[PDB]
PDB file of all heavy atoms in Angstrom:
ATOM      1  N   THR A   1     -10.454 -11.688 -16.076  1.00  0.00           N
ATOM      2  CA  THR A   1      -9.325 -12.566 -16.372  1.00  0.00           C
ATOM      3  C   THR A   1      -8.860 -13.242 -15.098  1.00  0.00           C
ATOM      4  O   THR A   1      -9.196 -12.804 -13.979  1.00  0.00           O
ATOM      5  CB  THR A   1      -8.137 -11.722 -16.860  1.00  0.00           C
ATOM      6  OG1 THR A   1      -7.812 -10.742 -15.854  1.00  0.00           O
ATOM      7  CG2 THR A   1      -8.478 -11.011 -18.195  1.00  0.00           C
ATOM      8  N   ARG A   2      -8.030 -14.263 -15.250  1.00  0.00           N
ATOM      9  CA  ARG A   2      -7.487 -14.966 -14.095  1.00  0.00           C
ATOM     10  C   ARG A   2      -6.870 -14.016 -13.101  1.00  0.00           C
ATOM     11  O   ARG A   2      -7.179 -14.085 -11.907  1.00  0.00           O
ATOM     12  CB  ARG A   2      -6.478 -16.028 -14.520  1.00  0.00           C
ATOM     13  CG  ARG A   2      -5.743 -16.652 -13.360  1.00  0.00           C
ATOM     14  CD  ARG A   2      -5.165 -17.999 -13.721  1.00  0.00           C
ATOM     15  NE  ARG A   2      -6.201 -18.977 -14.012  1.00  0.00           N
ATOM     16  CZ  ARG A   2      -6.014 -20.058 -14.764  1.00  0.00           C
ATOM     17  NH1 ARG A   2      -4.825 -20.285 -15.309  1.00  0.00           N
ATOM     18  NH2 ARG A   2      -7.025 -20.908 -14.976  1.00  0.00           N
ATOM     19  N   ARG A   3      -6.018 -13.121 -13.590  1.00  0.00           N
ATOM     20  CA  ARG A   3      -5.286 -12.166 -12.751  1.00  0.00           C
ATOM     21  C   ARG A   3      -6.305 -11.352 -11.969  1.00  0.00           C
ATOM     22  O   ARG A   3      -6.163 -11.129 -10.755  1.00  0.00           O
ATOM     23  CB  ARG A   3      -4.452 -11.242 -13.627  1.00  0.00           C
ATOM     24  CG  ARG A   3      -3.363 -10.470 -12.920  1.00  0.00           C
ATOM     25  CD  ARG A   3      -2.102 -11.310 -12.890  1.00  0.00           C
ATOM     26  NE  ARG A   3      -0.901 -10.568 -13.278  1.00  0.00           N
ATOM     27  CZ  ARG A   3      -0.281 -10.697 -14.449  1.00  0.00           C
ATOM     28  NH1 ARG A   3      -0.736 -11.540 -15.372  1.00  0.00           N
ATOM     29  NH2 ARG A   3       0.805  -9.980 -14.699  1.00  0.00           N
ATOM     30  N   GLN A   4      -7.358 -10.940 -12.663  1.00  0.00           N
ATOM     31  CA  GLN A   4      -8.383 -10.178 -12.011  1.00  0.00           C
ATOM     32  C   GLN A   4      -9.077 -10.979 -10.890  1.00  0.00           C
ATOM     33  O   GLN A   4      -9.279 -10.462  -9.792  1.00  0.00           O
ATOM     34  CB  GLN A   4      -9.369  -9.667 -13.035  1.00  0.00           C
ATOM     35  CG  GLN A   4      -8.875  -8.425 -13.748  1.00  0.00           C
ATOM     36  CD  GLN A   4      -9.637  -8.157 -15.024  1.00  0.00           C
ATOM     37  OE1 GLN A   4     -10.121  -9.075 -15.688  1.00  0.00           O
ATOM     38  NE2 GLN A   4      -9.746  -6.897 -15.378  1.00  0.00           N
ATOM     39  N   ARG A   5      -9.424 -12.234 -11.163  1.00  0.00           N
ATOM     40  CA  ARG A   5     -10.087 -13.059 -10.171  1.00  0.00           C
ATOM     41  C   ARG A   5      -9.196 -13.304  -8.979  1.00  0.00           C
ATOM     42  O   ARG A   5      -9.666 -13.259  -7.833  1.00  0.00           O
ATOM     43  CB  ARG A   5     -10.480 -14.387 -10.760  1.00  0.00           C
ATOM     44  CG  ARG A   5     -11.805 -14.368 -11.504  1.00  0.00           C
ATOM     45  CD  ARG A   5     -12.250 -15.790 -11.708  1.00  0.00           C
ATOM     46  NE  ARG A   5     -11.148 -16.588 -12.256  1.00  0.00           N
ATOM     47  CZ  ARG A   5     -10.883 -16.677 -13.561  1.00  0.00           C
ATOM     48  NH1 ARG A   5     -11.641 -16.012 -14.412  1.00  0.00           N
ATOM     49  NH2 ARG A   5      -9.871 -17.418 -13.997  1.00  0.00           N
ATOM     50  N   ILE A   6      -7.910 -13.547  -9.240  1.00  0.00           N
ATOM     51  CA  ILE A   6      -6.983 -13.775  -8.147  1.00  0.00           C
ATOM     52  C   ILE A   6      -6.932 -12.611  -7.165  1.00  0.00           C
ATOM     53  O   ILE A   6      -6.834 -12.822  -5.958  1.00  0.00           O
ATOM     54  CB  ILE A   6      -5.572 -14.093  -8.635  1.00  0.00           C
ATOM     55  CG1 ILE A   6      -5.609 -15.313  -9.564  1.00  0.00           C
ATOM     56  CG2 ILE A   6      -4.669 -14.400  -7.446  1.00  0.00           C
ATOM     57  CD1 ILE A   6      -4.241 -15.749 -10.059  1.00  0.00           C
ATOM     58  N   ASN A   7      -6.989 -11.390  -7.673  1.00  0.00           N
ATOM     59  CA  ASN A   7      -6.860 -10.236  -6.815  1.00  0.00           C
ATOM     60  C   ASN A   7      -8.125 -10.025  -6.050  1.00  0.00           C
ATOM     61  O   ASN A   7      -8.099  -9.752  -4.841  1.00  0.00           O
ATOM     62  CB  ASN A   7      -6.445  -9.017  -7.613  1.00  0.00           C
ATOM     63  CG  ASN A   7      -4.974  -9.083  -7.997  1.00  0.00           C
ATOM     64  OD1 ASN A   7      -4.091  -9.008  -7.131  1.00  0.00           O
ATOM     65  ND2 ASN A   7      -4.701  -9.289  -9.281  1.00  0.00           N
ATOM     66  N   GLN A   8      -9.235 -10.243  -6.745  1.00  0.00           N
ATOM     67  CA  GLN A   8     -10.520 -10.172  -6.118  1.00  0.00           C
ATOM     68  C   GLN A   8     -10.574 -11.144  -4.925  1.00  0.00           C
ATOM     69  O   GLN A   8     -11.094 -10.791  -3.867  1.00  0.00           O
ATOM     70  CB  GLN A   8     -11.635 -10.464  -7.109  1.00  0.00           C
ATOM     71  CG  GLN A   8     -12.978 -10.017  -6.560  1.00  0.00           C
ATOM     72  CD  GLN A   8     -14.156 -10.380  -7.438  1.00  0.00           C
ATOM     73  OE1 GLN A   8     -14.192 -11.457  -8.039  1.00  0.00           O
ATOM     74  NE2 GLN A   8     -15.144  -9.488  -7.501  1.00  0.00           N
ATOM     75  N   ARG A   9     -10.042 -12.353  -5.092  1.00  0.00           N
ATOM     76  CA  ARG A   9     -10.090 -13.306  -4.013  1.00  0.00           C
ATOM     77  C   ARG A   9      -9.223 -12.816  -2.847  1.00  0.00           C
ATOM     78  O   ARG A   9      -9.636 -12.875  -1.679  1.00  0.00           O
ATOM     79  CB  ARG A   9      -9.705 -14.705  -4.473  1.00  0.00           C
ATOM     80  CG  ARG A   9     -10.794 -15.339  -5.312  1.00  0.00           C
ATOM     81  CD  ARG A   9     -10.719 -16.846  -5.323  1.00  0.00           C
ATOM     82  NE  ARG A   9      -9.482 -17.340  -5.934  1.00  0.00           N
ATOM     83  CZ  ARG A   9      -9.284 -17.537  -7.258  1.00  0.00           C
ATOM     84  NH1 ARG A   9     -10.226 -17.266  -8.173  1.00  0.00           N
ATOM     85  NH2 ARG A   9      -8.128 -18.023  -7.668  1.00  0.00           N
ATOM     86  N   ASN A  10      -8.055 -12.274  -3.174  1.00  0.00           N
ATOM     87  CA  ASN A  10      -7.201 -11.679  -2.175  1.00  0.00           C
ATOM     88  C   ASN A  10      -7.931 -10.569  -1.397  1.00  0.00           C
ATOM     89  O   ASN A  10      -7.751 -10.423  -0.185  1.00  0.00           O
ATOM     90  CB  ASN A  10      -5.919 -11.172  -2.825  1.00  0.00           C
ATOM     91  CG  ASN A  10      -4.910 -12.279  -3.059  1.00  0.00           C
ATOM     92  OD1 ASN A  10      -5.006 -13.370  -2.489  1.00  0.00           O
ATOM     93  ND2 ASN A  10      -3.936 -12.008  -3.907  1.00  0.00           N
ATOM     94  N   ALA A  11      -8.775  -9.817  -2.091  1.00  0.00           N
ATOM     95  CA  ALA A  11      -9.512  -8.747  -1.461  1.00  0.00           C
ATOM     96  C   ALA A  11     -10.594  -9.360  -0.573  1.00  0.00           C
ATOM     97  O   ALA A  11     -10.696  -9.044   0.628  1.00  0.00           O
ATOM     98  CB  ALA A  11     -10.115  -7.836  -2.511  1.00  0.00           C
ATOM     99  N   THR A  12     -11.382 -10.255  -1.163  1.00  0.00           N
ATOM    100  CA  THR A  12     -12.378 -11.002  -0.422  1.00  0.00           C
ATOM    101  C   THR A  12     -11.803 -11.633   0.833  1.00  0.00           C
ATOM    102  O   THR A  12     -12.371 -11.489   1.914  1.00  0.00           O
ATOM    103  CB  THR A  12     -12.979 -12.106  -1.279  1.00  0.00           C
ATOM    104  OG1 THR A  12     -13.704 -11.492  -2.337  1.00  0.00           O
ATOM    105  CG2 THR A  12     -13.943 -12.934  -0.468  1.00  0.00           C
ATOM    106  N   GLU A  13     -10.683 -12.340   0.685  1.00  0.00           N
ATOM    107  CA  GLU A  13     -10.029 -12.954   1.832  1.00  0.00           C
ATOM    108  C   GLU A  13      -9.720 -11.897   2.906  1.00  0.00           C
ATOM    109  O   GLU A  13      -9.881 -12.169   4.079  1.00  0.00           O
ATOM    110  CB  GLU A  13      -8.766 -13.714   1.405  1.00  0.00           C
ATOM    111  CG  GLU A  13      -8.090 -14.535   2.501  1.00  0.00           C
ATOM    112  CD  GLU A  13      -8.781 -15.866   2.771  1.00  0.00           C
ATOM    113  OE1 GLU A  13     -10.016 -15.937   2.600  1.00  0.00           O
ATOM    114  OE2 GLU A  13      -8.101 -16.855   3.152  1.00  0.00           O
ATOM    115  N   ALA A  14      -9.314 -10.694   2.495  1.00  0.00           N
ATOM    116  CA  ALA A  14      -9.017  -9.604   3.438  1.00  0.00           C
ATOM    117  C   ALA A  14     -10.206  -9.121   4.301  1.00  0.00           C
ATOM    118  O   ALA A  14      -9.996  -8.666   5.425  1.00  0.00           O
ATOM    119  CB  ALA A  14      -8.390  -8.425   2.708  1.00  0.00           C
ATOM    120  N   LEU A  15     -11.430  -9.195   3.772  1.00  0.00           N
ATOM    121  CA  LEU A  15     -12.628  -8.886   4.545  1.00  0.00           C
ATOM    122  C   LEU A  15     -12.841  -9.922   5.615  1.00  0.00           C
ATOM    123  O   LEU A  15     -13.498  -9.654   6.624  1.00  0.00           O
ATOM    124  CB  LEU A  15     -13.873  -8.894   3.677  1.00  0.00           C
ATOM    125  CG  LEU A  15     -14.075  -7.766   2.670  1.00  0.00           C
ATOM    126  CD1 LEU A  15     -15.283  -8.051   1.788  1.00  0.00           C
ATOM    127  CD2 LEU A  15     -14.229  -6.435   3.390  1.00  0.00           C
ATOM    128  N   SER A  16     -12.299 -11.117   5.409  1.00  0.00           N
ATOM    129  CA  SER A  16     -12.615 -12.192   6.320  1.00  0.00           C
ATOM    130  C   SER A  16     -12.550 -11.733   7.786  1.00  0.00           C
ATOM    131  O   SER A  16     -13.382 -12.133   8.592  1.00  0.00           O
ATOM    132  CB  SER A  16     -11.749 -13.413   6.065  1.00  0.00           C
ATOM    133  OG  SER A  16     -10.632 -13.419   6.918  1.00  0.00           O
ATOM    134  N   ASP A  17     -11.593 -10.873   8.117  1.00  0.00           N
ATOM    135  CA  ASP A  17     -11.449 -10.374   9.489  1.00  0.00           C
ATOM    136  C   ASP A  17     -12.716  -9.770  10.063  1.00  0.00           C
ATOM    137  O   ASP A  17     -13.108 -10.104  11.171  1.00  0.00           O
ATOM    138  CB  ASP A  17     -10.318  -9.355   9.583  1.00  0.00           C
ATOM    139  CG  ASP A  17      -9.063  -9.935  10.196  1.00  0.00           C
ATOM    140  OD1 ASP A  17      -9.119 -11.060  10.752  1.00  0.00           O
ATOM    141  OD2 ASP A  17      -8.020  -9.256  10.126  1.00  0.00           O
ATOM    142  N   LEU A  18     -13.357  -8.896   9.297  1.00  0.00           N
ATOM    143  CA  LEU A  18     -14.575  -8.211   9.731  1.00  0.00           C
ATOM    144  C   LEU A  18     -15.745  -9.134  10.093  1.00  0.00           C
ATOM    145  O   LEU A  18     -16.757  -8.677  10.615  1.00  0.00           O
ATOM    146  CB  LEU A  18     -15.042  -7.214   8.663  1.00  0.00           C
ATOM    147  CG  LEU A  18     -14.025  -6.252   8.043  1.00  0.00           C
ATOM    148  CD1 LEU A  18     -14.690  -5.475   6.919  1.00  0.00           C
ATOM    149  CD2 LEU A  18     -13.421  -5.302   9.069  1.00  0.00           C
ATOM    150  N   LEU A  19     -15.622 -10.420   9.800  1.00  0.00           N
ATOM    151  CA  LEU A  19     -16.693 -11.372  10.074  1.00  0.00           C
ATOM    152  C   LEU A  19     -16.259 -12.217  11.240  1.00  0.00           C
ATOM    153  O   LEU A  19     -16.982 -13.090  11.703  1.00  0.00           O
ATOM    154  CB  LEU A  19     -16.971 -12.243   8.840  1.00  0.00           C
ATOM    155  CG  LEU A  19     -17.527 -11.468   7.633  1.00  0.00           C
ATOM    156  CD1 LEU A  19     -17.524 -12.292   6.364  1.00  0.00           C
ATOM    157  CD2 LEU A  19     -18.938 -10.996   7.911  1.00  0.00           C
ATOM    158  N   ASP A  20     -15.047 -11.964  11.701  1.00  0.00           N
ATOM    159  CA  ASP A  20     -14.515 -12.708  12.817  1.00  0.00           C
ATOM    160  C   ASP A  20     -15.073 -12.148  14.126  1.00  0.00           C
ATOM    161  O   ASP A  20     -15.271 -10.929  14.287  1.00  0.00           O
ATOM    162  CB  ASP A  20     -12.990 -12.668  12.821  1.00  0.00           C
ATOM    163  CG  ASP A  20     -12.400 -13.549  13.893  1.00  0.00           C
ATOM    164  OD1 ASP A  20     -12.517 -14.790  13.802  1.00  0.00           O
ATOM    165  OD2 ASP A  20     -11.816 -13.001  14.839  1.00  0.00           O
ATOM    166  N   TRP A  21     -15.332 -13.058  15.050  1.00  0.00           N
ATOM    167  CA  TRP A  21     -15.797 -12.704  16.379  1.00  0.00           C
ATOM    168  C   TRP A  21     -15.001 -11.604  17.107  1.00  0.00           C
ATOM    169  O   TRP A  21     -15.597 -10.774  17.795  1.00  0.00           O
ATOM    170  CB  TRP A  21     -15.852 -13.952  17.221  1.00  0.00           C
ATOM    171  CG  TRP A  21     -17.033 -14.807  16.938  1.00  0.00           C
ATOM    172  CD1 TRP A  21     -17.018 -16.121  16.616  1.00  0.00           C
ATOM    173  CD2 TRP A  21     -18.415 -14.421  17.003  1.00  0.00           C
ATOM    174  NE1 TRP A  21     -18.301 -16.589  16.463  1.00  0.00           N
ATOM    175  CE2 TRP A  21     -19.178 -15.559  16.697  1.00  0.00           C
ATOM    176  CE3 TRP A  21     -19.077 -13.226  17.301  1.00  0.00           C
ATOM    177  CZ2 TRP A  21     -20.575 -15.539  16.673  1.00  0.00           C
ATOM    178  CZ3 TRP A  21     -20.464 -13.199  17.255  1.00  0.00           C
ATOM    179  CH2 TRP A  21     -21.198 -14.350  16.950  1.00  0.00           C
ATOM    180  N   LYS A  22     -13.678 -11.577  16.937  1.00  0.00           N
ATOM    181  CA  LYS A  22     -12.850 -10.479  17.464  1.00  0.00           C
ATOM    182  C   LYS A  22     -13.415  -9.106  17.116  1.00  0.00           C
ATOM    183  O   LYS A  22     -13.092  -8.124  17.780  1.00  0.00           O
ATOM    184  CB  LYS A  22     -11.401 -10.547  16.953  1.00  0.00           C
ATOM    185  CG  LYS A  22     -10.579 -11.752  17.393  1.00  0.00           C
ATOM    186  CD  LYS A  22      -9.439 -11.992  16.398  1.00  0.00           C
ATOM    187  CE  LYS A  22      -8.525 -13.146  16.801  1.00  0.00           C
ATOM    188  NZ  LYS A  22      -9.170 -14.494  16.816  1.00  0.00           N
ATOM    189  N   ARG A  23     -14.234  -9.026  16.069  1.00  0.00           N
ATOM    190  CA  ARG A  23     -14.795  -7.737  15.656  1.00  0.00           C
ATOM    191  C   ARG A  23     -16.299  -7.635  15.860  1.00  0.00           C
ATOM    192  O   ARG A  23     -16.800  -6.566  16.207  1.00  0.00           O
ATOM    193  CB  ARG A  23     -14.442  -7.389  14.212  1.00  0.00           C
ATOM    194  CG  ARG A  23     -14.721  -5.930  13.905  1.00  0.00           C
ATOM    195  CD  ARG A  23     -14.640  -5.601  12.429  1.00  0.00           C
ATOM    196  NE  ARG A  23     -15.454  -4.430  12.092  1.00  0.00           N
ATOM    197  CZ  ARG A  23     -16.750  -4.481  11.778  1.00  0.00           C
ATOM    198  NH1 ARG A  23     -17.382  -5.647  11.754  1.00  0.00           N
ATOM    199  NH2 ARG A  23     -17.422  -3.373  11.486  1.00  0.00           N
ATOM    200  N   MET A  24     -17.011  -8.731  15.623  1.00  0.00           N
ATOM    201  CA  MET A  24     -18.459  -8.761  15.788  1.00  0.00           C
ATOM    202  C   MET A  24     -18.807  -8.859  17.266  1.00  0.00           C
ATOM    203  O   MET A  24     -19.918  -8.508  17.679  1.00  0.00           O
ATOM    204  CB  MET A  24     -19.052  -9.965  15.068  1.00  0.00           C
ATOM    205  CG  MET A  24     -18.575 -10.130  13.648  1.00  0.00           C
ATOM    206  SD  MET A  24     -19.507  -9.085  12.535  1.00  0.00           S
ATOM    207  CE  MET A  24     -20.626 -10.299  11.856  1.00  0.00           C
ATOM    208  N   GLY A  25     -17.856  -9.352  18.055  1.00  0.00           N
ATOM    209  CA  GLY A  25     -18.045  -9.517  19.498  1.00  0.00           C
ATOM    210  C   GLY A  25     -18.296  -8.212  20.225  1.00  0.00           C
ATOM    211  O   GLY A  25     -18.920  -8.196  21.279  1.00  0.00           O
ATOM    212  N   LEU A  26     -17.802  -7.124  19.642  1.00  0.00           N
ATOM    213  CA  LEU A  26     -17.990  -5.787  20.164  1.00  0.00           C
ATOM    214  C   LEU A  26     -19.465  -5.460  20.229  1.00  0.00           C
ATOM    215  O   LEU A  26     -19.941  -4.946  21.234  1.00  0.00           O
ATOM    216  CB  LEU A  26     -17.264  -4.745  19.301  1.00  0.00           C
ATOM    217  CG  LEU A  26     -15.757  -4.922  19.038  1.00  0.00           C
ATOM    218  CD1 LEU A  26     -15.208  -3.658  18.382  1.00  0.00           C
ATOM    219  CD2 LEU A  26     -14.936  -5.315  20.275  1.00  0.00           C
ATOM    220  N   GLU A  27     -20.192  -5.759  19.158  1.00  0.00           N
ATOM    221  CA  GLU A  27     -21.625  -5.499  19.141  1.00  0.00           C
ATOM    222  C   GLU A  27     -22.296  -6.169  20.325  1.00  0.00           C
ATOM    223  O   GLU A  27     -23.149  -5.573  20.972  1.00  0.00           O
ATOM    224  CB  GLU A  27     -22.250  -5.934  17.824  1.00  0.00           C
ATOM    225  CG  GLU A  27     -21.622  -5.260  16.622  1.00  0.00           C
ATOM    226  CD  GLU A  27     -21.385  -3.770  16.827  1.00  0.00           C
ATOM    227  OE1 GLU A  27     -22.369  -3.024  17.036  1.00  0.00           O
ATOM    228  OE2 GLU A  27     -20.209  -3.348  16.777  1.00  0.00           O
ATOM    229  N   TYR A  28     -21.887  -7.388  20.636  1.00  0.00           N
ATOM    230  CA  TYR A  28     -22.390  -8.043  21.827  1.00  0.00           C
ATOM    231  C   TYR A  28     -22.055  -7.224  23.071  1.00  0.00           C
ATOM    232  O   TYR A  28     -22.886  -7.080  23.959  1.00  0.00           O
ATOM    233  CB  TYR A  28     -21.850  -9.463  21.942  1.00  0.00           C
ATOM    234  CG  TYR A  28     -22.750 -10.490  21.306  1.00  0.00           C
ATOM    235  CD1 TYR A  28     -22.836 -10.602  19.911  1.00  0.00           C
ATOM    236  CD2 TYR A  28     -23.517 -11.359  22.086  1.00  0.00           C
ATOM    237  CE1 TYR A  28     -23.666 -11.541  19.313  1.00  0.00           C
ATOM    238  CE2 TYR A  28     -24.344 -12.307  21.494  1.00  0.00           C
ATOM    239  CZ  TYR A  28     -24.415 -12.391  20.104  1.00  0.00           C
ATOM    240  OH  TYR A  28     -25.226 -13.319  19.487  1.00  0.00           O
ATOM    241  N   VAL A  29     -20.841  -6.673  23.105  1.00  0.00           N
ATOM    242  CA  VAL A  29     -20.383  -5.823  24.205  1.00  0.00           C
ATOM    243  C   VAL A  29     -21.288  -4.597  24.322  1.00  0.00           C
ATOM    244  O   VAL A  29     -21.918  -4.402  25.361  1.00  0.00           O
ATOM    245  CB  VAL A  29     -18.885  -5.434  24.043  1.00  0.00           C
ATOM    246  CG1 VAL A  29     -18.517  -4.239  24.917  1.00  0.00           C
ATOM    247  CG2 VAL A  29     -17.984  -6.625  24.351  1.00  0.00           C
TER     248      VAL A  29
END
């Protein structure tokens, strides 16, 4: 349902951080 998709997107958006260089940059370190 819409409500379900909206929350899923909110969750998806929350992962966005883990793909950010501030976090992946460590592996380079």
